[PDB]
Design a protein around this ligand. Structure first.
Ligand SMILES: O=C1Cc2cc(Nc3nc(Cl)ncc3Br)ccc2N1
Ligand SMILES: O=C1Cc2cc(Nc3nc(Cl)ncc3Br)ccc2N1
Ligand SMILES: [Cl-]
Ligand SMILES: [Cl-]
Lengths: 124, 4, 124, 4
């Protein structure tokens, strides 16, 4: 086509989606990770995670307001990944890299899994 | 704005 | 912070949101523009438009499944803008620039209004 | 991935 493109549009959209998350506006699901709860937008979770995409395209699960993750999932690892989903920034640290990679594998977040594997390989 |  | 960033994340998120729109997945509102109807995600509309942000943060309007735009709004201009919201690409043409700018002013999409004013100024 |  003969379209023009606004370079910053996708980033500005994500920034606004994160502002809605921060103010709890139009969040439509709670993700339960053991004793912790995380409110989010189903569409954003689906756009970032193969696992949430599969869950919310399911004809029954699409209507659930609460999703319980596997008890092996670490709440901090999930929190770091949820922040990444809404900002493109990943808080990857020596103390959290194992929990973050395990959570990203479960959530099916391929690019996060890739950078975790590379950062681990560099330290061995 | 750019030509994509 | 000491975060790393995935350059393409925001773009990939928007691409996935557009895939959900194309398959009518988790769309939660119909925008009526005269005889035409457009299905969309309230969060995406809010992230792109000052008008939709104001509408869906209203304690009553936030719960509406149908929003009727002003009858002066052109369905094609709205369609072009809805596509822009979900892709960052704007199909700006000599034949549609006036309808697109008028729709972007109503929807409060400042960057679109700016490029329309510049393209019009170049042709005068 | 980059240093933002
Ligand atoms: O690593 C990742 C990230 C991700 C996101 C989605 N999400 C969607 N995929 C498609 Cl094709 N259409 C719409 C949506 Br929402 C699917 C798989 C994966 N794997
Ligand atoms: O030209 C534009 C585009 C746009 C988008 C929003 N959307 C939001 N703004 C804020 Cl501050 N927080 C969350 C959201 Br969603 C508000 C105003 C405008 N004007
Ligand atoms: Cl990822
Ligand atoms: Cl805009």
């Amino acid at each position: 086509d003969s379209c023009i493109q606004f370079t910053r549009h996708a980033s500005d959209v994500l920034l606004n989606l994160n502002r809605l998350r921060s103010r709890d506006i139009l969040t439509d699901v709670v993700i339960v990770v053991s004793r912790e709860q995380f409110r989010a937008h189903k569409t954003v979770l689906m756009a970032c995670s193969g696992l949430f995409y599969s869950i919310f395209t399911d004809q029954l699960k699409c209507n659930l307001s609460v999703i319980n993750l596997d008890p092996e999932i670490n709440p901090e690892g999930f929190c770091i990944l949820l922040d990444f989903m809404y900002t493109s920034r990943l808080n990857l640290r020596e103390g959290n890299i194992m929990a973050v990679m395990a959570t990203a594998m479960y959530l099916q977040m391929e690019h996060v899994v890739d950078t975790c594997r590379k950062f681990i390989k560099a330290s061995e | 704005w750019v030509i994509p």
